[PDB]
Structure formats: structure tokens, C-alpha cells
Amino acid sequence: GAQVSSQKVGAHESTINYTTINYYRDSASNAASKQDFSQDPSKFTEPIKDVLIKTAPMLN
Amino acid sequence: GAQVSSQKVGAHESTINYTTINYYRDSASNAASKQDFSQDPSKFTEPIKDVLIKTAPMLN
Amino acid sequence: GAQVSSQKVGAHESTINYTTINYYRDSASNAASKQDFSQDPSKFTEPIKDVLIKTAPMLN
Amino acid sequence: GSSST
Amino acid sequence: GSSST
Amino acid sequence: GSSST
Amino acid sequence: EACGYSDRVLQLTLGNSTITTQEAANSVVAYGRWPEYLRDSEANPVDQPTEPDVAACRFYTLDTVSWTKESRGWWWKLPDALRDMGLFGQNMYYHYLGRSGYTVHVQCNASKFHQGALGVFAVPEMCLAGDSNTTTMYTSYQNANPGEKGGTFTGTFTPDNNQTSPARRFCPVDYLLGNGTLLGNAFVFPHQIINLRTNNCATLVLPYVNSLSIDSMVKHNNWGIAILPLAPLNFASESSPEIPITLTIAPMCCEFNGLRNITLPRLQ
Amino acid sequence: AATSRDALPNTEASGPTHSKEIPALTAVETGATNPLVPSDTVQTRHVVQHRSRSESSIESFFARGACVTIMTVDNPASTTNKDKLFAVWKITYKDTVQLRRKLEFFTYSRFDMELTFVVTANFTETNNGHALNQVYQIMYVPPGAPVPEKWDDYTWQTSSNPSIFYTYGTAPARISVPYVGISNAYSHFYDGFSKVPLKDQSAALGDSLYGAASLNDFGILAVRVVNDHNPTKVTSKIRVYLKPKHIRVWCPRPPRAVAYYGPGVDYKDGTLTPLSTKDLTTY
Amino acid sequence: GLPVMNTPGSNQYLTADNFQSPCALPEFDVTPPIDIPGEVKNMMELAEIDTMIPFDLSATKKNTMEMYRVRLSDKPHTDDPILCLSLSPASDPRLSHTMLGEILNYYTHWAGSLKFTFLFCGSMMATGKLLVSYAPPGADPPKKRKEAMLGTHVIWDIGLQSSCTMVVPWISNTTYRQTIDDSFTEGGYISVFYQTRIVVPLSTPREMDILGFVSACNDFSVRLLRDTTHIEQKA
Amino acid sequence: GLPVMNTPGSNQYLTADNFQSPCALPEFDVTPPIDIPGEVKNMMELAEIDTMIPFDLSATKKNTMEMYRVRLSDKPHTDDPILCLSLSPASDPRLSHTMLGEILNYYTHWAGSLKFTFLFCGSMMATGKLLVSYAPPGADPPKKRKEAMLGTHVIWDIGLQSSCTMVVPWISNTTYRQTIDDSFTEGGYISVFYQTRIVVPLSTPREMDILGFVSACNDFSVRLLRDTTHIEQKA
Amino acid sequence: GLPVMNTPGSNQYLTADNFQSPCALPEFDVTPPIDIPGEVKNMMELAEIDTMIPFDLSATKKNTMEMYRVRLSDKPHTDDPILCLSLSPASDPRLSHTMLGEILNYYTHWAGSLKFTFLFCGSMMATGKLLVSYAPPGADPPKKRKEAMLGTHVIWDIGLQSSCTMVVPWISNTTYRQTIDDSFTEGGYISVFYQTRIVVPLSTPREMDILGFVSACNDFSVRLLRDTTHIEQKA
Ligand SMILES: CCCCCCCCCCCCC/C=C\[C@H](O)[C@H](N)CO
Ligand SMILES: *C(=O)CCCCCCCCCCCCC
Ligand SMILES: *C(=O)CCCCCCCCCCCCC
Ligand SMILES: *C(=O)CCCCCCCCCCCCC
């Protein structure tokens, strides 16, 4: 049940990996993976009904 | 001898699993798996000799 | 070098197993396996030269 | 080795 | 056994 | 590796 | 059924005895388990069991009691209530060990103008509370075991103040089910209700229940039968109505081990 | 194959009805509970049910250590007139009330028992003397084995009895024990006696307590401070926590509604009125 | 030795933990189980059984057999309540001690549908129509049939099928309600009214009791285990 | 280091534990075993061997050779007991010090069948029939042949086969009995009676001894190891 | 037991650690998520939203609505600044409390391009050309259009497209700048000038406001999490 993931190696001395085994039944007990996703800011930066083309006039 | 089971993941950050190894000869020393079964309440809620059909009269 | 054996499961909540690894060179350092054998009591209960048939007279 | 549930 | 990410 | 009893 | 069969009309036959009823409310099989003989995989005493079959697995009728507006309720213990019943009782007292299931049939008819409702409960290990606040767990064997006459519930706890010669009997308070738990919850035990407008009887089929496969019937009661008026007897405008309650109980799949001379208990 | 953590049934959408099917009408005399669901008596929408009964499985309901006793011991100056106190406790879940009430929702049970021991100590006299770190011996003395009469007598050798030597200030001690009953299940209630009174025998001779089976059901724990007497007296307490692991239960019972009064089901006068005043037509 | 680094939580005793520990009685010969009747696998099974409601907790009726009896009579039709009850299954004094109420007091949160079944215990000759109501929270609690009619209800016709059930469907803002009196997670109002009136012939009792039962539906669940207030041990 | 978290039970010494530990004499040249006769693999093997019962623990006979001798005589037939004994193999004073009784006092629980074998030590010319009885518990303990006859029994005819065995079959309510005197787990009554009488010709001793032995059957077992009360060390 | 050797760091509590620990509420029934609108995955998403700049923090205008209003008028052309601002997004008092500035105060380091957008809030009849400037650091901060012209700039023509954006491109010696006032990691100068002048017809307001907004570009990032000075709890 071991999970093997790669580290993003910053300062250097192949891929360096690290290992993780969950010891508990409850997922709440797990550490944080930090394997997170990004999204586009559009729902906040461009919430307009008609798609914005930045080279065009915003008002036409 | 490792046992690998899945966690029911509640709050999220695939299947997340966890690992279990029993360290002792006596099953009494084992932790609780919590992998438990449910049953129908009928032996207490419907202990009648003739099967009950809920849309029908209980007395006929 | 892991040894995997089964537990005789007494109270219940497949075969449940447990794992054992010996950490030392000397067998004297090992835990007790408790995987023991039984024998027939005859060398103490029936040490007679002529085999005893229990339905027959012990003296003939 | 490994059991899986 | 082992997962790999 | 692993023995099994 | 189109050929006339009904939930309300039943016939039960065990040994040389038959019960009929025309106003049943179906019948209950406690925990969905019908009585059975002890299986070899669960067996414990190794001697050949005695299994009296029809000689003991038949309907025995106990003494009829009377329901009135002041009735607080009645109780019996099994096998105790049947200890003097024909060859069942004999088999019981001659053997160290015994196990048995039961068909319990409570009988109480009245009329379309009467009203009232009896809760009929079968309780596994029906431990009742004693009359004492000077000594706990003090109810004597003789008082714990009334035989067929049974015992009664009371609406009032009254502590035995005679310290010199204590009564040593139960004081089972009705809303506390005689055991310190609320009567409204007794329905989690196998039960039926005799509600006079609806039915004139209760039928409970009880499996042998215990933490052992077989045990001392003389030392230990497996089941308790508790009958309490959930709704009081009432009729027309009479101030003092009465209707009888009769218990008929049949042992089922009973077997006994450890035969010796007969037990002669101190019952008074 | 239905597991404790499975989602409960979905609500199925249901519309208006006008028929001879009568789910709402029933007859509780039969001894049965009417198995209805909302779509039987009202119009429902479709709902995908995610909730589960995982936390109310018998295992989960009991999966907690409960305190069942507090044992007191000490280690006095050698010069004291009073004997060094060692403790003896008859193992039971009935000296406290909370775990007892939970187990008593059922008539019978089977389980492996986990015992955890929390140990605390303090000074008693307004002294200024110190004491070095104490080691405690928790010995299980099963029915039949010699119970200790003195903090230091031969029984504390434990050649065969299991003992825990606990060091103060370390993690609380813990052991497990299998289902050790002499019956196929533990009886939370025993409607009987351990003796039959015979006519040919005196009443005293045939007598025994109501509802009591083996006088020494499970034996005792005997606890001592192993350290020799110290000029300054220290008193300690060992709190015992019981957790039923791997549990099975049979025959449900109404819960205890009035205060416990002894190891039996007896009740005390003046404690029999749990319920409070509330008017029939008042919300 | 294997290089190890002790983390927070080390040496604590959490009473809800789930670890292995050494067996004090190794190789013990365990007695096998037998098939005892009545095994329970989940506490909600017990909550699905009907237990009887102590509706009438008046000063003289409480803590007596009478508390379970709701008295009806053949009086002329009224639009006034036979009984009024709050849907607070763990905390309303009439529900909190039923088997359902009791199990709910070992948990912080409850959810799902419930059902109330009433049993008419008058004579066969007695007839009647009653209205059983459930009003979800947020308006004036029904004190007159006119309001109760507007909510969830069953009009009960008394007859051979002795009993009648009203299902209180899970209708809530929150995904779980609290097992205490709480305005934010309030459940609403249960009430019973005369729809026509109880009618009896001559030579018949003019007053009678109905009994009421509550139980959980198959969609009912609880969570966050906790200690109950329904037992204590002062000293 | 590997992140680790110390659990309860840490650093305790449980005397029944089963862990590895470092060897103080590494690479030691162990002397090999040889095949010594009489190896034992299980304590119940010893319990299956017949050892002799100290039946007569009277004030003058106890702790002397005489305690093992049960005296019979050629007196006229009586229905009165030669001996009476309780089936409490670890606690009845006549059984508790037999090899079976001794091993049982290192355990809390016993189960299984037992057997009693009696040896007639009179002269060849002496004849007799005796009745050996086992009454399971719960009735008046047999004091007359009439009662003892009704339970488990063997009628022993004295002759060339010198000895006779009565098997006490496992008949119990509980799955295991306690190794102390306990009413709930009581075993019942062992007793011996004259069936006819001992008869001798002239020139023959009119009194003689029988000896008795107890041993376990192959279905016999014990559990829950414990310390015995049969040895101590005061000071 | 497995031979282990405790390493440095053992038993410490690092508040930034990431270890497993026992669950105090095992088998708890978690309420599922629903699809709530507005989920955020990264704090820089918030930094990419335009928030309004409190440009005019004069003693009378600060901490009032007026601080956000930059007043322009139709006065004759001048080469003197409408506003001057330091590119110190976490520490210059005009930028530090914008949403960008606020998020930057939870981090030690920032990097990437930014953008300033100005909104003309005069009447439709008002016209004008303005010059928006960014001077990278190291020379005299621009106080006259003549200098500001020589750096990065946008000449804004006022008209139907109400607003105009100047991008401050990432131009830095270091790979990340500090989120405090620091000469070594200074960012340079933002300023606005009149390119021609605001012109209005008659019957028209001669003074009006422009509003300004700042937001991060898609190449913008922060690092080294830290506590902010923008909140405290004295006592
Ligand atoms: C070194 C410490 C070892 C401790 C060993 C404890 C062994 C004794 C186990 C006792 C089991 C108690 C179970 C609870 C009570 C019973 O359920 C009821 N009274 C019915 O039999
Ligand atoms: C998947 O996990 C299979 C590989 C197992 C590797 C060794 C596990 C190390 C110890 C984990 C103990 C269990 C934690 C409760
Ligand atoms: C099955 O268990 C084979 C895999 C073994 C994985 C590593 C075991 C980790 C240490 C267990 C030590 C033994 C416990 C007594
Ligand atoms: C056989 O042992 C191969 C599998 C190895 C499993 C992991 C071993 C766990 C740590 C043991 C350390 C060595 C003990 C001295």
C-alpha cells in the first residue's frame, strides 16, 4: 500500500522520490499530500456573460 | 502479510488506501478493522410468522 | 525474510495472519513461535511391552 | 505478501 | 503494493 | 522474501 | 385466501393438544428463530440426551387470572411456570441440564362493547428488582420462583422495612418494567398486544435463548412473560368490570442431559 | 454484503395516489412495526442519499475506552504505624455507570477486552522531602490463585499470573485479553441463582444471591508500588479504562432509566421519577 | 538501530484510538460462539422498532403508567388539539426517553425520516376520524385544525385496521440536526386533531385511550458519538 | 529519522509478553540435544496418567500412607456409602493433590471427561459386587444406593481383572468449569456402594482395601494459566 | 522489539510539519460536499482581480471614501504630476491594503508583472490625454513629464473605452523582491501626468475623478509564508 511520488528538487548536491504509507483507516488522519491543482481566475477576473477578447474594444 | 484497504474519503484536498500489519500471534491483540456488516431489522421490526405486505391490510 | 502465519481467531468482529521478522543473528534472541506439537501420552499411560486392546481383558 | 480489500 | 505518482 | 505458515 | 384463510383464524396443534382461535393478530416468532434441538456442532454435555417429544411438547394451561380496573400487571418465568406440568416437569427435575423453546398462547376475550389493551411481552433473562433498600440482589429462590401462579406488578415501590425478618421478594414497578427501564420501550422485546376491539389472544413462539447451549432449568429461567395493561379495562359504564386472562404454554424441542435422582427443591 | 459504511437508500420520486393500497393503515397488535418510508404517505422527489450508519455499528458505538475503576495505592515512610497500601479490585464493568449502561442495551455480548491504565501520583504531607520515580506492579490474580495479603509477600513473584510493571511518567500501560467467558457469550443479565435450595437441606445451606452466577466471575487486579518505603509518603491512583474490541451483541433491551443501585437491577426509593412535567398540548 | 524521529501525539492516550497491544493471556483456548437468537449489527436497527410515547407528562400522570395514555372522548367536534409535540426527538421530554430518543442521546447529530403510529384502544363499537399532522418549522405552531391541515398530514379513519401511521419525512435545512433543543436545527410540530368526532352507541364507554409509537425509517442515521445525560453517578 | 509515534503500552513490562531481545552471549557454541527418553509435549499428557486418590483424609489417617486405603469388609449388605466425593477436581481435598488436581491448580478453567479406576486389593478368594456412581449436580447428593443407582454408574464384579473403571462423562452447563469450589460450575457427586457384599471363605481376611485412581480422558483440557495455592514462601 | 535509534528533532512540535495523527472521531459519517460557486484553488487568483487604490491618503482624505478619488480638472497643461507612487506593492501605503497588497503581506517575497488600470469618471463631454508612467529604479524619481516619458509608459486617450491599462513588466535585479521597503529590492516609480489637458464644453463640470486599480499578471508569484502586520491583538 505504499505511495511513491516525486519531489520537485530545488537545490542539487534522475527523479528523487519519497514514500508514503497511510497508517490509519480514517482519511482525516492522513497528512496533506500537497499535490494540488491550479485553476484559471476567470470566474472572478472575467465573470462577464459575453467572452472578452483583449485586443478588441471591451465595449462595442 | 500486509493488508491494504481503502479509506472512505470524506473531505478532499483515485482510491486512498491504508496499510495494516498484525504484529502479534493472538487475534485479541489486533486493532478493530471497522469493516463491519449491516443487517435488516426484521427479526425485531417484523417478527411475525406470516410475511407482511405493507400496502395490504395487516389484518385480513 | 518475513514469516507470515495465521492466527487462530477466537472472537470475531477469511484467514487473519500476522507477520514476524527476526532481527538478530542468535536464535536465542527470537520470540517464541507458539507453533507447537502434540504427542500421544502412551509412553506414560501405556508403557507396557504388549499393546493394550481396551475391549479385551488386560490380563489373559 | 499483501492482501487487498 | 505500490502506487506511483 | 516471505515464508508462509 | 379466496378459500377463506385468515390471519385472524388459527389452529395450533402440539402433541395431543389443539388450540383454535378466530380473533388472532397473526402470531410472533421471537427474533425470527423457530425452536430447534441442540446441533452437534454446538453441543456440550456428551451423554445421550432425553427428548420427551409429545409427552412434554404439548399445551399446558396455567391457573386463570382476573383482569380488573385496578390490575397493574402479571409476570411468569420459564421454565418455572411449567415446573409442575405433567411429564415436562418430571423430566426437568430428574436431569441436571435441560433446554426448551415454547409456544405461549395468552387468551382473553370480551365483547364489542368492552375496551382495553394488554401488552404481552416475552423477555430473555427477565431479571426483576427486589423489595429491599437495605440489601441488593436479595430476593429468595422461593419468591423468585412462584411456579404457575406467577407474580404481579405494582404501581408503587415500597421498601421492605422489616430488617429482622425481611420479605425477600420482588417489588416490580410497572412503568419501570419491574427492572428499572421504561415500559414504553418493552416493545423491543418480542411481543403482541391484546387490544380487545381487535384480537382476543397473543401468540409468541419462543426459541431457547441463553449464553449457553444448555443449562440448569432449576437454577435459571430463560424467558420471562410480562403482561401489563397498556390501556385499562373498561366496559359500558360498569365501575367494576372483570374479564379473565388464561395462559396456555407448550414446551417445544426440549432436551435434557445429566440424569440422576430427582430434584426436590425448597419452594416455600 | 451490505456494509456499515454503505449509503442508505435513495428516496424515489412518487406522485399522487388513489387506490385500495393502504400503507398508512396498520395494526400494532401483531407485534410488528409498519415498514413505511415517506413516499408511502406523501409526494416525494428523487434524492440520492449519501448518508451512512457507519458510526452506529455495534463496534463503533463501543469503540471508546471507558473508566471502570480507580485503584488507590501508596508508599509510606517505614516508620508508619499503618501498613503500606496495596489495592485489590474485583474486575467488573459495574462499579461505574456509563459503559455499564451502554452494554446493557443488550442481554449478551462477546468481545476482546483492551485495558488501558492511567497512573497519577502526589505528595500528601506538607513536607519538603522528595521521592524517586515509582514502578507499579499490576498483577492479575484469576479465581483460585493466592490473593496478596501484604505489599511484599510471595504472590508478587507472578510465575504464572500475568503482571504489568509500569514505570511512572511513561505512556499509559495497555494490554489485550481474548473473549475469556466460560459461556459462549458474556451474560449482562442472569435471571437465576447459582444454587438450588433443597428441602432436605437447611435454608442457609441452599441460599444464594439473585442473579449472581460465579461469586468470583473474573478474578481481581492487585496493584502495588514496587519501590521500598520512602521518608516522604506518596499516594497514587491507577485509573482503569476498558474498551470492548471485536464485539458482538444479542437481544436488545430498554436502557437503564433510573439510577443504578448495586450490581443487580435493583432500584432505590426516591430515584424512580426520571420524567419531567410537560403538558399534553404544549409544544 | 533504525533511525527514527518521534512525532507529536507520541505517548498520549486517546480513548478513541485503535491500536494493537500485547495479549496478557497468550494461547488461551477461546470458547466458540453459538448461534444465539437476536443478534444486532447496528444501533439504528433498534431505532427502527416502534416504542411507546409518554405523551401525557402532566404533574400527576408523569412517571406513572398513565403518561402513555392519550384520552379521547365522544364530545362534539372541536378544532382544538388532542396533543402537541415538538419534533426534537432527542430533547422533547415526550420523545427523548423512547428507544429512538435514548439512542439519539449517545450521538450529537441525527438525520432522516421518522414515523408516528397511533393505536386506537376504544371498543369495536366506537368510530371516529382523526387528523395527524406534521408542520415543518418556521411559522406559528398549529393550535387549530385549520393550520395543521396545511402541513403534512394523515386523516385517520378508525376501524378494523386498528392503527394508523403518519411519516414525518426528512425536511431540513441542514444535512444533520442537533440532538439538543436548537432553533437553527429545529424540526417543527407534531399534532393530533379530531377530524369528525368519536361516536359511540349506547351501553358503550364514551372515553377511551389512544397509544402512540415512534420509530425511525430506513433512511435514518446518527453521528458523532457522545455521552448521554440520561444517566449519572453523583458520588 | 523515520517519523514514529509512541503508542500506549510503550515501555511497560508485561510478564506474559513475547518479544525478541539482544543475546548476551553471541556466537555461543550450544551443546546439541540428545534423545532423552520421556519427553513431554503438553501438561495434559500428565493429567491422562492414573494417580492414586487420598480418599480417607480423617484426622488420624491424613498425611499418612493410610489415607490412600479405602477399607472394605465382608459385613452384611448395606445401602450405605463406602465413600462420597465431590466432582471438584482442583478443589475437593481428595482430588486437588492428585497429579490431575495439581496441574488444574495452575489453571483457572477445566473441561472434559474424567475416569475413576478402582483396584481391589483383597485376597483371590474374596469376591464381591460394588456399585460406582456419578450423579450430575442439582439434586440431593446420594447417600443411599437407591439414589446413586439413578445416575451414571458401573456395577463392578470383582474377579481376575482386578480393576474397574467408571468414566465421568463431561456433563456441564458451562463450556468450562472453574478450578475452585463454585456452585454455578459444580460437577456433582462421586460415590461407591456395596451391590451385593464382600464374601470370603474361612481362613481368609475379612477386611481389605481398595485403592482408587483418577485420570483425564482424551477430551480433557484446561485454560487461563494462574499461580497455585499449593506452594508458598512466607518470608 | 525492532532496534530503533531516536534522531534529532524527536518529540518536537514544528507548526509547519505534515504528519499523520489518530482520528478522535473514527467512522464519523462526513457530510458530502456540494458544488458551491466561487471555489478558489490558489491565493494568486485573488491577486489577479482588480481592486481599487487609496491614492489620496492626505490627512483629511485618508480613511474616508475620498481617498480613492484622484481629482483632475480642465486647467491649462502642466508637466507636473497628478500622482506619484512607489512600486512597493506590499509596503507603499497606497498599495499595501489593496487585495494584492494584503496577500503579499502574508509572504516574504514577490515576483512578476503587475498592471494599473485607470477609470475616467468625468462626463461624456469631457476629453483628455494623460500619460501613465513606470520608471524602473536607480535614477531620480520622475517629477516632470520629461523624465517620466523616458521610462515605460502608456499615453491614454479618454473616450468610449472608459479605462486604460499600463502593465508594469517584471524588471528586477533579484529573482524575487522583498515585501517590505528595501533599497536593494526596490521596484521604481509609478506616476501619472497630463499629456494635453482635460477639455470640457460649457455647462459641464470642470473637475472630475479618476479611479485606479491594481492587479497581478499571470506571471506573478509569492513565497515564504509569514504573518502579517495588518492585524493584531493587543491584550
Ligand atoms: C495484567 C492485567 C490482565 C487483566 C486480565 C483481565 C481478565 C478478566 C476479563 C474480565 C471480562 C469481563 C467482562 C465483563 C463482564 C461480564 O460481561 C458479565 N458480568 C457477564 O458474564
Ligand atoms: C502496502 O502498504 C504494501 C507494502 C507494505 C510495506 C511495509 C509497511 C510498513 C509498516 C506499516 C504498518 C502498518 C501501519 C498501521
Ligand atoms: C507480510 O507481512 C510481508 C511484508 C512484510 C512487510 C514489512 C513488515 C514490517 C515489520 C513487521 C515486523 C514484525 C512484527 C512482529
Ligand atoms: C525479508 O526480511 C525481506 C523483507 C524485508 C522487509 C522489511 C524489513 C523491516 C526492517 C528489518 C530491519 C532489520 C532488522 C535488523
mmCIF file of C-alpha atoms and ligand atoms in Angstrom, chain C residues 1-2 22-24, chain F residues 1, ligand 4:
data_model
loop_
_atom_site.group_PDB
_atom_site.id
_atom_site.type_symbol
_atom_site.label_atom_id
_atom_site.label_comp_id
_atom_site.label_asym_id
_atom_site.label_seq_id
_atom_site.Cartn_x
_atom_site.Cartn_y
_atom_site.Cartn_z
ATOM 1 C CA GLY C 1 12.892 -12.670 5.362
ATOM 2 C CA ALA C 2 9.372 -12.089 6.715
ATOM 3 C CA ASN C 22 13.813 -11.882 13.254
ATOM 4 C CA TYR C 23 16.119 -9.005 13.980
ATOM 5 C CA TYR C 24 19.057 -10.902 15.467
ATOM 6 C CA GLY F 1 11.378 -12.751 0.857
HETATM 7 C C1 LIG L 4 12.894 -10.409 4.476
HETATM 8 O O1 LIG L 4 13.038 -9.989 5.626
HETATM 9 C C2 LIG L 4 12.781 -9.456 3.324
HETATM 10 C C3 LIG L 4 11.746 -8.375 3.624
HETATM 11 C C4 LIG L 4 12.300 -7.225 4.453
HETATM 12 C C5 LIG L 4 11.109 -6.461 4.999
HETATM 13 C C6 LIG L 4 11.470 -5.155 5.723
HETATM 14 C C7 LIG L 4 12.349 -5.414 6.948
HETATM 15 C C8 LIG L 4 11.945 -4.452 8.079
HETATM 16 C C9 LIG L 4 13.133 -3.962 8.890
HETATM 17 C C10 LIG L 4 14.074 -5.076 9.382
HETATM 18 C C11 LIG L 4 15.377 -4.408 9.770
HETATM 19 C C12 LIG L 4 16.433 -5.411 10.079
HETATM 20 C C13 LIG L 4 16.415 -5.855 11.497
HETATM 21 C C14 LIG L 4 17.871 -5.969 11.971
#
